[PDB]
Amino acid sequence: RLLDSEIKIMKSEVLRVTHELQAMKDKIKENSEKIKVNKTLPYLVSNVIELLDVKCAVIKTSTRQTYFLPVIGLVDAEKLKPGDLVGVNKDSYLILETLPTEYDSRVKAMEVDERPTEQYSDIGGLDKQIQELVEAIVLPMNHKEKFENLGIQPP
Amino acid sequence: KLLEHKEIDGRLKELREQLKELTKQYEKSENDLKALQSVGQIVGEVLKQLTEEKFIVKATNGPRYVVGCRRQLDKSKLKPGTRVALDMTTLTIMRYLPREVDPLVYNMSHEDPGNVSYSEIGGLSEQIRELREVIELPLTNPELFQRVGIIPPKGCLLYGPPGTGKTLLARAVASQLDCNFLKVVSSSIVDKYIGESARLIREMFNYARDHQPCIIFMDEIDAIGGRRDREIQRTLMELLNQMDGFDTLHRVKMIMATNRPDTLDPALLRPGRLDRKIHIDLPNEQARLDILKIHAGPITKHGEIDYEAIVKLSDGFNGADLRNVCTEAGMFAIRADHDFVVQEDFMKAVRKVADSKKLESKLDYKPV
Amino acid sequence: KRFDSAGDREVQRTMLELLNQLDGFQPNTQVKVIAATNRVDILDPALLRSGRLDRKIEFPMPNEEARARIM
Amino acid sequence: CTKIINADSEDPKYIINVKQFAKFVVDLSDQVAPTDIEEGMRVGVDRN
Numbered sequence: 001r002l003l004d005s006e007i008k009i010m011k012s013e014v015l016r017v018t019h020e021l022q023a024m025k026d027k028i029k030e031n032s033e034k035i036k037v038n039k040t041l042p043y044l045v046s047n048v049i050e051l052l053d054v055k056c057a058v059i060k061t062s063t064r065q066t067y068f069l070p071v072i073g074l075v076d077a078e079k080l081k082p083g084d085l086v087g088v089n090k091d092s093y094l095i096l097e098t099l100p101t102e103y104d105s106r107v108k109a110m111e112v113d114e115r116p117t118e119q120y121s122d123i124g125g126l127d128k129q130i131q132e133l134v135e136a137i138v139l140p141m142n143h144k145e146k147f148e149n150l151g152i153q154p155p
Numbered sequence: 156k157l158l159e160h161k162e163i164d165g166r167l168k169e170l171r172e173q174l175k176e177l178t179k180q181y182e183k184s185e186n187d188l189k190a191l192q193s194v195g196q197i198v199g200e201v202l203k204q205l206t207e208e209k210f211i212v213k214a215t216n217g218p219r220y221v222v223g224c225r226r227q228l229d230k231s232k233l234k235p236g237t238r239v240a241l242d243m244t245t246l247t248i249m250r251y252l253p254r255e256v257d258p259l260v261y262n263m264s265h266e267d268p269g270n271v272s273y274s275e276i277g278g279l280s281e282q283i284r285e286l287r288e289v290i291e292l293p294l295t296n297p298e299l300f301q302r303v304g305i306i307p308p309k310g311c312l313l314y315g316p317p318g319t320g321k322t323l324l325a326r327a328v329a330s331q332l333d334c335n336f337l338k339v340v341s342s343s344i345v346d347k348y349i350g351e352s353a354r355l356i357r358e359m360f361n362y363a364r365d366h367q368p369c370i371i372f373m374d375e376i377d378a379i380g381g382r383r384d385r386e387i388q389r390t391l392m393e394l395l396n397q398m399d400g401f402d403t404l405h406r407v408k409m410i411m412a413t414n415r416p417d418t419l420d421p422a423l424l425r426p427g428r429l430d431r432k433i434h435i436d437l438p439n440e441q442a443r444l445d446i447l448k449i450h451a452g453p454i455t456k457h458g459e460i461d462y463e464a465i466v467k468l469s470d471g472f473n474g475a476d477l478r479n480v481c482t483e484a485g486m487f488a489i490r491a492d493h494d495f496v497v498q499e500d501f502m503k504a505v506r507k508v509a510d511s512k513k514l515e516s517k518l519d520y521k522p523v
Numbered sequence: 524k525r526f527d528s529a530g531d532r533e534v535q536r537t538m539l540e541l542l543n544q545l546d547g548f549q550p551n552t553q554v555k556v557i558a559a560t561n562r563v564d565i566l567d568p569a570l571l572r573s574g575r576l577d578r579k580i581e582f583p584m585p586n587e588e589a590r591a592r593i594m
Numbered sequence: 595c596t597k598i599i600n601a602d603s604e605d606p607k608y609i610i611n612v613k614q615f616a617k618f619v620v621d622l623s624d625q626v627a628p629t630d631i632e633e634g635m636r637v638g639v640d641r642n
């Protein structure tokens with residue numbers, strides 16, 4: 001009458017799909033570990049050049065030789081862009097890593113890490129100059145609301 | 156009964172959706188593993204076609220080989236000057252690529268120029284007319300120059316004191332003309348590798364020809380345009396050659412801006428390279444009033460503002476000075492904790508910026 | 524000063540790159556620049572402009588209450 | 595040495611800039627330690 005027309009159906013189809021899902025997840029695990037063993041890193045960091053359709057990329061190596069890749073590799077096309085830093089296979093030159101851009105060692109040396117400590121009170125007589133520098137520099141960093149409410153370009 | 160049946164049926168639906176997601180993951184893994192089997196091909200420019208099958212390729216920064224096309228590629232389009240991929244086992248030609256973009260050039264095109272319109276530049280009306288007549292109209296309406304038969308002027312040179320609107324002029328032309336824009340800081344062309352800068356200029360002009368209509372705006376030209384350290388002169392030679400290579404048909408125009416046109420090499424001054432010149436002078440009294448009204452426009456001010464008095468005091472200012480005038484007036488209002496701006500703020504600001512101009516030991520400028 | 528004395532044009536080019544990395548074509552916001560010099564007469568009329576270095580802050584000889592405060 | 599990626603502080607993946615030859619993304623040997631290496635540092639690198 002009711003609930004008896006589906007007993008054999010609900011109790012077997014889901015089990016079969018679950019078995020297939022388990023096996024397919026296992027296959028994914030093997031494919032992923034095959035990728036992992038094929039992801040040992042001597043990478044040849046290289047710059048990206050314009051992409052092509054026939055989605056596929058052109059690479060300029062740190063060794064100043066250019067390659068074309070029939071397929072970009074393990075990175076996605078939407079992520080990459082010209083003048084990017086990618087780690088590629090040391091021999092097959094396929095792209096398998098996307099890197100943070102590095103400017104120069106000197107440029108990073110210019111960055112302040114120690115954060116010096118001289119207080120504004122330690123400066124004498126310069127109060128007008130102190131106020132000018134503060135209002136010019138710190139205020140745009142702090143609020144941006146007092147300037148935008150006026151419509152002015154902050155100095 | 157329907158609640159248990161719905162539980163199992165919804166679980167089946169969720170499990171099938173999860174299986175679809177897991178299938179997409181498996182296809183990702185299998186497809187990228189299949190991609191892992193692939194091997195990169197060597198890029199290289201091509202040269203003389205010795206026969207219908209033997210060609211001379213030249214790998215980018217590499218040796219010169221004699222190689223053959225694979226089996227099936229066209230042979231006619233394989234002309235001297237076509238980027239092609241090489242199989243890095245036999246070096247045979249395969250997959251002739253269109254041409255290099257040289258991501259330096261990509262950055263030199265896909266750069267934000269701003270929303271600047273012509274109604275934001277003030278006091279330059281005649282100069283805007285000239286620039287739009289030399290760079291916009293020959294591109295927008297080439298059939299005029301076709302029927303008239305006049306060879307359009309190749310490029311314009313913008314020169315003047317620092318802070319009068321040359322860069323602004325270029326910005327406006329870029330932001331308004333729906334085309335492909337090439338903006339260049341000339342010192343960016345300079346590179347320490349041997350002969351790289353000449354290649355950069357050649358590739359820039361080749362990208363210009365490939366992506367018409369385009370405008371090339373190299374700014375601070377004197378950096379690579381000074382009177383005849385070695386590489387800069389060798390690169391100016393290549394710039395001269397690429398400039399003179401302009402056939403009448405390309406929809407390609409060029410702007411160069413500089414603050415010291417005297418230092419510019421007189422080679423550029425010759426007609427046929429940069430014929431039309433424009434002097435962007437310090438704004439006149441009326442021009443200063445226009446510039447001030449444009450910049451101070453969006454400022455939330457109260458009461459009457461005597462722009463004419465400020466113009467009376469603002470003798471010899473540039474446009475940047477008036478922009479400062481507005482900024483300093485706003486800064487004074489902010490210091491006074493006033494949510495608004497009035498005349499005294501402008502008065503104090505113009506006096507302050509005049510005091511600053513005292514520092515700016517502005518040399519007398521003489522044109523080209 | 525641009526025209527100096529000239530094999531120093533490399534310094535000129537670097538300075539021009541700085542010049543246009545302060546105000547030219549693409550604007551640069553949220554990056555504040557501080558500069559210090561003792562010979563403002565030497566400097567360009569270009570990098571001493573108003574769009575690049577909006578504020579010119581003079582540091583005078585310390586006045587006598589300034590000297591007392593410094594001590 | 596350059597740009598210590600340190601994507602997880604577990605697989606640091608330091609970049610190197612071997613002069614006149616190349617630049618590589620590489621990892622430490624079993625001897626040296628993360629606290630030993632810094633950015634720059636003029637490291638030494640195996641040949642293969």
Ligand SMILES: Nc1ncnc2c1ncn2[C@@H]1O[C@H](COP(=O)(O)OP(=O)(O)OP(=O)(O)O)[C@@H](O)[C@H]1O
Pocket residue numbers: 275276277278279316317318319320321322323324412413414446449473474475476478542543546547548569574
């Ligand atoms: N006619 C004008 N109308 C509106 N604003 C102007 C005008 N002239 C100059 N300005 C302003 O002054 C500044 C000038 O900067 P810009 O870089 O365009 O000047 P430039 O003289 O072309 O530059 P450079 O010194 O690099 O050759 C900008 O902030 C701009 O808004």
Ligand SMILES: [Mg+2]
Pocket residue numbers: 321322374375412546547
């Ligand atoms: Mg400029």
